Design a protein around this ligand. Structure first.
Ligand SMILES: CCCCCCCCCCCCC/C=C/[C@H](O)[C@H](N)CO
Ligand SMILES: CCCCCCCCCCCCC/C=C/[C@H](O)[C@H](N)CO
Ligand SMILES: CCCCCCCCCCCCC/C=C/[C@H](O)[C@H](N)CO
Lengths: 246, 272, 44, 239, 48, 272, 44, 48, 272, 44
């Protein structure tokens, strides 16, 4: 009665057979903005059925020489559906997120994945140049990968100069192929400002890094996809104006 | 709690069902297995204090922040010496402060000024704080040095070092050392994103200093800034950087020539 | 022994106030919904 | 007016000094505070979080395969797996954890530590492992019948794939200095050695090479004292 | 007499500093105030 | 009120008769249309402070007031250096103070004295305040420097700057910076009305300074006057001057070469 | 925190006294005799 | 501020002087005491 | 007891059985025979005080502890001057402190710095305390002199001598000047046991000092350390050494050339 | 006459506290189990 769970948000449902306990980030539930902490005067809109649902991204084939992938979460759902449309028309934004990462295999495969969230996950340029005009900086497709995603070049340093070993302080979960096949994290709104633009500022970002490499004997299946589903819980929007893309 | 933790007397167990040493790590939680559910312990009344490990006792250190040169020549003179207020210029306090995501504190800036050869001659200096938006003084005899509606400190070199207290003046509710976004709208390029990570909520104006005299003073001073954090609150703890710093406002590291977090050993089956 | 006395009208110019001994460690160590007991298997 | 007198310590600038300073903005109200989740109050809230040990920090290894303990099927009945020191403020596997850096910022530590292992092999692969802690004294134990006299736990590979060896506090004095070098070997902690209890058995059509991830944290009796500078950064390039 | 000690910030002249100064005319009464219409108290009375 | 203003929750209206957005400006009153009688607002509990915008916190700044030169030569010497006490010599504090018609306050005069090349040698100075009607000292060895029944301050150059408090001593009930009249009766000319606007209620005597010695001191000092207003009350607010100042006691401006209050734009149908 | 203490017999030599939060804005914004209501036409 | 005045004996270092000194480690707790037999309190316990 | 002891009036005894003057010394106890059980005494109310003979009034003396030389040359320069904190360098305070086995106290270190020829020129010094385990500064311009998370004192030569208070920071419960053992395990040699008597519970770090300047300062300073014990508690009183000291961390004495505890006399049957 | 006043939060930075007049001399002078009387032979 602990390994099974059915999460229902809107008109979507996620059933599970091999699950650990759900993770609540920092022990705080995602709620609406109170009147004491708010600062805008205009009334925010709350669809609560059209943007609060499970959106499924693409799947990535977990190979043997894989490094890892990452995402900017207020920027992945920036163009997909009613949530993206409602976020392009508005200037302010505040919501939490519910995550679910699917990765199933047989009882003859071995491996482990580290899925965690990092608030203000800043991508660092890679180089040994200190001159201001040639210092390497990541492009826009590297900082904000969109709905597709981006890969790691040096996943041992999280592409930011911070070691992967010490990244266990964040809200994290493991996907051990002998124990479970999914990981679930519920993260609230974490920012130093009440509302913020969901276009030029990503609050946090998911990262999936295979710590133990994928191994199997010759004869089993070779395509191991990595699927991710996200539910924008308790969404609020303010400052209605023209729709901008980026 | 003024002490750490006391230990309950334990004993042995011979029974099935209770497994306190099989804490699963796949759930994302930390193992809560104590010593009392394991090898037989005793009754210890621990009175070791935990006061020094708090955040207010950990950030109550000054450290070096800024070094400002003032040549005040006769033919290649400038007169003034401004210094952008930022903490990322020296990696000690930067490494101590970048282990959190959001912070909020006050400051106790202290200014130690010495000469080139080192000497305390009675020369009076003027330390000016220019808030963001105010015009910067251009020259040792400019109009901005009147310090009307502008705080400034007058002190000599033979006097003790000056020390002022600075409140929390960010327009946001807290500071941040990591900004995953862009400061303004528009199309962002793919070649050189030099504005990525820039946070306008941290530009705390400019700090200027001159020598109060009439003609000139052929002396090269060198001021040092010591900022003591106080009344500090931190949120969202972040891991400590293991790579050497390369730039001030960017956490860039070396792609090749990587530094391992732990030094190498002879073999894995060897403790020494 | 008195360092709680301020000498100005502003409050940020004081010294370190009374120390707070609050230590909530469970928001980082056990951020889970189902409270895992101490003597039990974490998964069943 | 008042007949005052000066005493030694006048006109000095002590860095660790609590004293009221002169405010520069009179009558200033700051920005109101909001609710931000994840507030810290002390540095023991971070020490109680497990963090991946770097046990395979030897040579001939890349970056990502440096946090894994290789487990294979040994032909001889008893062989030695990975072993490492307990001292968190010492050059070694503990340098890669958060508790090691926090103990590096201080100079003396106390209290019990926790090392949590985790098997990341296949579901059909079974086996038993012996994680044995030994108090200070002689060097690393040579065989298992010598290392099993200390503090050890038999860990079998079942549905739960993680064991947590506690490292008790068996020191003579209250605090241990993180120096622990040369003539400071008085403050050593011991050696944790992982031995093969039965074997790593594996069925056919199954890879016979697994890995173990080692984590480490601190208990509730963990105590730190006397703040100092770290030795992980000595120089710096002009920024 | 009293064992005092000096601290940083001594012998400086901060412009934005509330402190009592030495009076030059002792025992002086100023001209009495009258009623003048249009008294201001803050700078938000002009912004409105 | 310690905060600014809270906002009442509003909604939409569909009814005739109530027109809150048609406030007539011909009546000379200011439009009192709030946000709640308009676009639907929310409930905001504002706690922004209004303490800094008060008059006592706005006029509590020193600023530069007067600059007095003292050469003290050997062959072209004078000895003393008087300075008429007036605030119209520097346009910063003048612009800050001429936005009201009648004011009443106290003073915190501060004297910063430096040398020509800039140096604090231990020379004792004598700052004398000569009230209106008292004889002025003529010479560094005059009879008036006895300071009997006259306030004076003795201080050195190596000492901190002197600072005295000055009460309200105008014979009227308040000061005034704009006097629409003449000081005396008689026939007034048409060619040059040089006495128009002169207010005898503002002549606060003369300020003199010398060097206390016997023979001479070949040093050119330069004193600066910093006056901090306190206990200030203002009446009849006046608009801020938009033209550059030309004289001290007269608000004269340039007839030709006029400065517009706002800079020019590209077109009227363009925001940038 | 005490700055209301004077050190001389004269009263003008003190510092800034207790701040007054009085704000009468209606003597400049609505200097009219007939009080114009908020929901009404100003002229009829 | 306070009109103080200095008196003879200023800026001297008397060796036999009871006076509070500035602490260098703020908020520091020492090692707890244990029971050690043979504690002395005065020098007449050795003269007897 | 604030006084020493009062005397009871006594008289003569003529009776058998009571022998107060036959106290046996073979039992290891001290003779408890008073004057009242002997020659006829009187009633004396003694009010001589015993306050000066206490331990806190006996160890409240500064004394010389350490002498640190700082040459700061131009061609054979070092810049810094470290000093291992130990009390065994000067035999006065060592002889006063080695009459006990276990002690526990606080410190009131005072630093008197003079020049070679003797002169107080206004040069600012930096006194740094390096705890055991921290890196030592190597050079007058090293990275360790930032004093972040490290206590240091900034003072000039013209200033009064600095004085700080030091708590009890030994990892054991008390200090000890005599350690009958070895610091670590292993086989110990027979030739030269240079590690015998070494106590790791007494290494109180290192004390360093430099001159805060930019280029150099051709001056040879000489600092003196004066440590005042306070809040002192002593255990297990030990006899006073009668032999001259030879080494710092070892109580070695001369095998030949022995010094007698008492000087020689003419004859035993002679008092003078 | 007041020297019991401390000026810091730490307690080791104070001066000499109240003096203790305790003098136990019998733990060094008569460390014996059988209490030898004053008027008696120490051995019988
Ligand atoms: C009278 C001279 C005073 C000199 C000090 C200037 C006062 C303003 C200091 C503001 C304190 C800001 C502390 C750090 C702010 C931001 O985080 C940094 N600029 C970014 O690292
Ligand atoms: C002992 C030297 C004291 C030096 C200061 C002189 C004391 C008298 C100062 C009176 C304060 C007057 C402030 C301004 C007055 C009139 O408004 C101006 N003269 C006209 O602008
Ligand atoms: C800021 C500079 C302070 C200089 C003084 C250093 C502070 C640490 C002093 C510790 C006091 C230890 C007193 C004696 C300790 C051991 O018994 C001796 N090292 C062995 O004789």
């Amino acid at each position: 009665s602990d390994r099974v769970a059915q999460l229902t948000v809107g008109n979507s449902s996620i059933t599970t057979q091999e699950a650990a306990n759900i993770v609540l980030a920092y022990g705080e539930w995602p709620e609406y903005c109170p009147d004491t902490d708010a600062t805008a005067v205009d009334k925010p809109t709350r669809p609560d059925v059209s943007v609060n649902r499970f959106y499924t991204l693409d799947s990535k084939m977990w190979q043997e020489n894989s490094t890892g992938w990452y995402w900017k979460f207020p920027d992945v759902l920036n163009k997909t559906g009613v949530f993206g449309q409602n976020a392009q028309f508005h200037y302010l934004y505040r919501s939490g997120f519910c995550l679910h990462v699917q990765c199933n295999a047989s009882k003859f495969h071995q491996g482990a994945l580290l899925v965690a969230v990092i608030p203000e996950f800043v991508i660092a340029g890679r180089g040994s140049n200190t001159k201001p005009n040639e210092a390497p900086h990541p492009g826009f497709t590297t900082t904000f990968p969109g709905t597709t995603g981006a890969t790691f070049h040096d996943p041992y340093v999280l592409d930011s100069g911070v070691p992967l070993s010490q990244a266990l302080i964040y809200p994290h979960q493991w996907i051990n192929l002998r124990t479970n096949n999914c990981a679930t994290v519920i993260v609230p709104y974490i920012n130093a400002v009440p509302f913020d633009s969901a276009i030029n500022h990503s609050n946090f970002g998911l990262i999936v890094i295979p710590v133990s490499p994928l191994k199997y004997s010759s004869g089993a299946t070779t395509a191991i996809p990595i699927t991710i589903t996200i539910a924008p819980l308790n969404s609020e929007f303010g400052g209605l104006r023209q729709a901008v893309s980026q | 709690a003024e002490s750490a933790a006391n230990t309950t007397p334990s004993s042995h167990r011979l029974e099935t069902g209770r497994v306190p040493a099989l804490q699963a790590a796949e759930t994302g939680a930390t193992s809560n297995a104590t010593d009392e559910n394991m090898i037989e312990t005793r009754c210890v009344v621990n009175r070791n204090g935990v006061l020094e490990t708090t955040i207010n006792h950990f950030f109550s250190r000054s450290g070096l922040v800024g070094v400002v040169n003032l040549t005040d020549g006769g033919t290649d003179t400038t007169g003034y010496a401004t210094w952008d207020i930022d903490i990322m210029g020296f990696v000690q306090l930067r490494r101590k402060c970048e282990m959190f995501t959001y912070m909020r504190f006050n400051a106790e800036f202290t200014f130690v000024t010495t000469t080139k050869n080192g000497e305390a001659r009675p020369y009076m200096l003027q330390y000016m704080y220019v808030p963001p938006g105010a015009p910067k003084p251009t020259g040792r005899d400019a109009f901005q040095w009147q310090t009307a509606t502008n705080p400034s400190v007058f002190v000599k070199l033979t006097d003790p070092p000056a020390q002022v207290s600075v409140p929390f003046m960010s327009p946001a509710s807290a500071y941040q050392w990591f900004y995953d976004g862009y400061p303004t709208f528009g199309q962002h390029p793919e070649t050189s994103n030099t504005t990525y990570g820039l946070c306008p909520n941290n530009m705390m104006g400019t700090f200027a200093v001159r020598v109060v005299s009439r003609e000139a003073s052929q002396l090269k001073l060198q001021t040092r800034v010591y900022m003591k954090l106080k009344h500090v609150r931190a949120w969202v703890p972040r891991p400590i950087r293991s790579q050497p710093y390369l730039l001030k406002n960017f956490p860039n590291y070396d792609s090749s020539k990587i530094t391992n977090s732990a030094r190498d050993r002879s073999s894995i089956k060897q403790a020494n | 022994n008195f360092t709680n006395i301020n000498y100005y009208k502003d409050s940020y110019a004081a010294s370190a106030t009374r120390q707070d001994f609050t230590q909530d460690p469970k928001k980082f160590t056990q951020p889970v919904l189902d409270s895992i007991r101490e003597l039990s298997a974490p998964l069943n | 007016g008042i007949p005052a007198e000066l005493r030694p310590g006048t006109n000095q600038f002590l860095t660790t000094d609590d004293d009221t300073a002169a405010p520069i903005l009179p009558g200033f109200t700051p920005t109101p505070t909001i609710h931000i989740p994840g507030e810290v109050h002390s540095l023991l809230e971070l020490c109680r979080v497990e963090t991946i040990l770097e046990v395979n920090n030897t040579t001939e290894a890349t970056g990502l395969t440096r946090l894994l303990i290789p487990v294979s099927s040994q032909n001889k009945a008893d062989e030695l797996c990975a072993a490492f020191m307990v001292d968190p403020g010492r050059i070694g596997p503990w340098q890669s954890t958060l508790v090691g850096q926090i103990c590096r910022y201080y100079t003396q530590w106390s209290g019990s530590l926790k090392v949590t292992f985790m098997f990341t092999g296949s579901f059909m692969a079974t086996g038993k492992m012996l994680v044995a802690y030994s108090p200070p004294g002689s060097a690393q134990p040579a065989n298992r019948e010598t290392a099993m006299l200390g503090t050890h736990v038999i860990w079998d590979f079942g549905l739960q794939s993680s064991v947590s060896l506690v490292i008790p506090w068996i020191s003579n004095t209250h605090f241990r200095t993180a120096k622990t070098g040369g003539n400071y070997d008085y403050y050593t902690a011991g050696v944790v050695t992982l031995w093969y209890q039965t074997n790593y058995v594996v069925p056919p059509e199954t890879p016979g090479e697994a890995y173990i991830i080692a984590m480490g944290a601190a208990q509730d009796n963990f105590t730190l004292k006397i703040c100092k500078d770290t030795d992980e950064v000595t120089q710096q390039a002009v920024l």
